[PDB]
Amino acid sequence: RWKRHISEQLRRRDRLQRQA
Numbered sequence: 001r002w003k004r005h006i007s008e009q010l011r012r013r014d015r016l017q018r019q020a
Contacts, residue, residue: 009016 006016
């Protein structure tokens with residue numbers, strides 16, 4: 001499910017990679 005919430009983020013603002 002997170003794939004839909006990340007697919008748009010990782011594509012726009014992939015700032016989660018640093019958040020972990």
